[PDB]
Every structure is written in C-alpha cells, then in structure tokens.
Write a protein that binds this ligand. Structure first.
Ligand SMILES: OC[C@H]1O[C@@H](O[C@H]2[C@H](O[C@H]3[C@H](O[C@H]4[C@H](O[C@H]5[C@H](O[C@H]6[C@H](O[C@@H]7[C@@H](O)[C@H](O)[C@@H](CO)O[C@H]7O)O[C@H](CO)[C@@H](O)[C@@H]6O)O[C@H](CO)[C@@H](O)[C@@H]5O)O[C@H](CO)[C@@H](O)[C@@H]4O)O[C@H](CO)[C@@H](O)[C@@H]3O)O[C@H](CO)[C@@H](O)[C@@H]2O)[C@H](O)[C@@H](O)[C@@H]1O
Length: 442
C-alpha cells in the first residue's frame, strides 16, 4: 500500500526534531522537548539513526550529518568513565540513562547505569558504522570510534543472575535486582550482547530470555501472539532488525515470526479500541494505539459514573500483560506499526491528523499523546487542556519520535533494515541466538 503525502511530512518534521533539539556541541539529544530537562542516551540512539534518513531525503547535507555524528561519537569515547557517584557519564562501557544536556555526566543520583538504554544507543552507533562506509577520513573515523564504543560494553559484567542481563547499576546500591525477561522490547539487548567479540554472552542468554515468553503467549482481541500490552515492545528492536522470515527456536516451534507477532499486536490494539470496553472517548477503528508515554496527571476522577485511575508518564498498553488504559493514545503506537499493518495504520494516522491535528500535529510532528476523555478542571503535570476536546501533551519524547521516523523510512525503502543487514555484529548476534531462514540464510 503506498503512503499519502502526509507521511513524507511526518517523516520530515520528526527528522527535524532530532536534528534541531540535539545539542550540537556534544550531540546529546533530549529525553523530552521543549521541557529539555536532561539528555537520554536512548534519545541519542535514535538521533544517530535519524541523521542518515535526513541525508537521503535531502533534509541535511552528508557533511553536516558526518560532523554531528563525529561530535557525538567522540563525546562518548572521551567522556569521563568510572564508578563514582558524580562526574562520570558511564562505567564498564555502559552509560547513565540520563546525562546533563551541557556537561554530559550523570544527571543526578536517581539515575541508573542502563543496559537497555546503552543498548538503544549502541544500535544507533552500529547504524553509523554500517552507513558511513565512504573513503572520507571522517567516515573512517566514524567506523573506528563506533567499533571502539561497542567493544567496550562489558555485557558479561551485568550477568548477575546466570546468563540473564540485569537492568542496570547504581554506585550507591549495586546491581539492579530486575532482569531483562521476555517478552518486551529488549530483544536487541541480547542480540548486542550475543554479537560482541570482546565481552559477549553465551547462546544460553537468549534461551532463558525466552523462558518467560509463555506467560505472555495467548489470545487477545482475535490474535494469538506474545501479548505484551505496550505497542513499543513490538517496535524498538524491529526498528533496526528485520524480523520477517528469520526464526529462532521459539518461533520455529510456534511456526510464526516476530514480524507477524508485531502485526498481530497491532490489529489487536485496533480491535481493542473498536470494542472499547472501557468506553473511553473517541476510541475507534481509526483512533487507537496505547503505549508508554505522557499523560495529564496522577489522579482519580469520575468518568461515566465510575472511578478511574489516570496517570501522567506511564506504561500504557492493550494486551494480556502491562495493559494500563487511561484514555490516552500516543500516535507513535499506531504510526510506528506502519510496517506491520499499513492497511490500518495509514487511515489511523490520517484520521488522527484530521480530527486532532490543529492541536496534536505541531512543529516536530505528533506530540507525545492525547486524551479526548480528560476535560477535568485540575492542575496538570504536563500538557494542556483544549476546551471540550480533552488534553494534549506539551512535550515530544525522543524514544517515541525515533520509531515514527525510522519505521516510515523502513516502509518507503527498508532503509534502516538494509543498513543493519550489513553489520557483522548484528548478524553474529542473531545467529548465536538460534535465528535461521530468510536473510540470515547462507
Ligand atoms: O523511576 C525511574 C525514574 O523514571 C523517570 O521517568 C522517566 C521514564 O522512566 C520510566 C521508565 O521508562 C524507561 C523504559 O525502560 C526502563 C525500564 O522499564 C522497563 C520495565 O522495568 C521495570 C522497572 O523500570 C521497575 O523499576 C521495576 C519495578 O519492580 O519493574 C520493572 O518491570 O519493564 C518493562 C517490561 O515489563 C519494560 O518494557 C520497561 O522498559 O526500567 C529499567 C530499570 O530502571 C530502566 O533502566 C529502563 O530505562 O523504557 C525505555 C527503554 O525501552 C526507557 O528509555 C524509558 O526511559 O520505565 C519505568 C517502568 O515502566 C518507569 O517506572 C519510569 O518512570 O522515562 C521517560 C522516557 O524516557 C522519561 O520521560 C521519564 O522522565 C522519572 O523522571 C524519575 O524520577 C524516576 O526515578
């Protein structure tokens, strides 16, 4: 199905987000903007993937993108590293999730050294490694620094419980007691750990990652799949990795793949909004999509003569696990699933843009979220009230923006996937996890 012109505008504004809102002195992209409290290393991951999308669509010159990319990779290479409570950006090749926008160190002491967030960064880093393949000495320098940053990550260090990778680490309390367990958006964590030639993990790590899959497998809204409620779980890893046809052991046994798993998640989200058992306002066949993102406030209000819990930033979803629902829809959820179900995502995007766009579609594309049900006369943590038209976010969230841009690019010409199909570490990672068939086939 071809894309209407609206999608080329969405692609562009969302690229422009990462180009503009990033600090150019160090290449740190904000967690959110315009609030701009601090940077996220996961923002940076999506930024590095964004810049070459801009080159190919002519929104930025190759030379600007190189200069920006080099600034970014050199910032991380040269950042102070160490176990100390202040003054460091990272440790053991990992980095703090959140760094100060100007000085680049751990924002504050509540900030963890993050495995999944380092992971997301590294996806962008390896993207730069496989994209900037020219004989420019700058592109060569990009390849080498990227290579160095990936090799320094000590995945093994974070294996506290057996082959399973911990979520992170604090100077003040030691390892985080939670582990990355399936199913969710962390497939690419274990891929990166499996593909490492310096500090790599064993195939075992994947096996046990999959042990908890069977808590999530079942039937929701007419579909049989791994039913993690938050849409993004089905998107982040799929940004860089093409999951069509290739099958690991679990999917070989189920007889599907992770691409079909995302597609099933997306139709189910849609059918959830059609049934709309919670009877949230405007939920319907072309107004849907629940995932982690902003909302109006931590509160309880009466809605249709019942008491309903409402959150600001929170996991939101539609599925058998982690399925909180406020009435707030995040555009990234439907849009970033363009590649999985374009026959429903296209009219969804058009419908939300038409109905809501005079307040929802702003300078850098879709704002993070909106809630047509929320018209209470109360203080907000963020966003704003539009009279008799509900609530809308005031911030964009980079990790919500990143997949909007990258998944539209993958729809148009499979650009992001094709670049990563050239990275030796991603391939190795997948092969060592047990993946076979499709493009992995020799
Ligand atoms: O309380 C932490 C600080 O949160 C700040 O709020 C920011 C907000 O952070 C979210 C966080 O979003 C990140 C998320 O991935 C993180 C990961 O969450 C995973 C989840 O893990 C749970 C743990 O977080 C939790 O401690 C334990 C408690 O028992 O339960 C775990 O299940 O598990 C699901 C699977 O079921 C995963 O899908 C989910 O990703 O938690 C890790 C451990 O800390 C983090 O390292 C990891 O970053 O998603 C992306 C990565 O895909 C990441 O960029 C997000 O930032 O999610 C948790 C759990 O949902 C929230 O509690 C937390 O509020 O992130 C947004 C966007 O970046 C940012 O705008 C917010 O500012 C507060 O500001 C801080 O004050 C607070 O200390």
């Amino acid at each position: 199905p071809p894309l209407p012109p609206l999608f080329s505008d969405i692609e562009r504004r969302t690229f422009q987000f990462f180009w503009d809102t990033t600090n150019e002195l160090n290449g740190l992209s904000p967690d959110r903007f315009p609030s701009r409290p601090f940077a996220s290393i996961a923002s940076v991951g999506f930024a590095l993937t964004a810049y070459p999308i801009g080159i190919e669509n002519g929104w930025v010159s190759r030379n600007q993108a190189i200069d920006r990319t080099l600034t970014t990779l050199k910032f991380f290479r040269d950042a102070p590293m160490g176990p100390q409570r202040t003054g460091k950006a990272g440790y053991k090749g990992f980095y703090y999730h959140f760094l100060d926008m100007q000085q680049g160190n751990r924002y504050d002491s509540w900030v963890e050294l993050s495995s999944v967030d380092t992971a997301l960064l590294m996806m962008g880093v390896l993207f730069t490694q496989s994209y900037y393949d020219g004989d420019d000495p700058r592109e060569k320098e990009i390849r080498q620094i990227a290579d160095t940053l990936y090799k320094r990550v000590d995945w093994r260090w974070l294996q506290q419980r057996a082959p399973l990778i911990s979520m992170g680490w604090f100077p003040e309390s030691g390892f985080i007691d939670h582990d990355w367990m399936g199913y969710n958006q962390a497939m690419m964590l274990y891929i990166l750990a499996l593909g490492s030639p310096t500090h790599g993990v064993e195939p075992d790590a994947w096996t046990v990652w999959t042990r908890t899959y069977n808590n999530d497998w079942g039937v929701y809204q007419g579909q049989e799949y791994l039913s993690f409620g938050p849409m993004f779980g089905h998107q982040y890893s799929h940004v860089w990795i093409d999951f069509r046809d290739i099958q690991d052991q679990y999917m070989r046994e189920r007889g599907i793949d992770y691409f079909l798993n995302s597609r099933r998640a997306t139709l189910a989200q849609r059918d959830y909004a059609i049934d709309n058992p919670m009877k949230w306002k405007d939920y319907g066949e072309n107004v849907w999509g629940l995932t982690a993102g902003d909302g109006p406030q931590n509160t309880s209000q009466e809605y249709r003569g019942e008491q309903r819990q409402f959150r600001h930033y929170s996991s939101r979803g539609a599925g058998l696990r982690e399925n909180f629902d406020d009435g707030t829809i995040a555009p990234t959820a439907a849009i970033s699933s363009i590649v999985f179900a374009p026959e429903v995502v296209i009219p969804a995007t058009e419908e939300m843009h038409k109905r809501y766009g005079d307040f929802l579609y702003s300078s850098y594309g879709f704002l993070d979220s909106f809630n047509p049900s929320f018209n209470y006369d109360i203080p907000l943590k963020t966003g704003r009230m539009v009279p008799d038209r509900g609530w809308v976010a005031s911030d964009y969230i980079a990790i919500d923006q990143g997949p909007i841009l990258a998944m539209i690019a993958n729809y148009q010409n499979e650009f992001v996937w094709n670049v990563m199909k050239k990275n030796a570490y991603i391939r190795t990672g997948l092969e060592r996890a047990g993946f076979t068939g499709g493009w992995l086939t020799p």
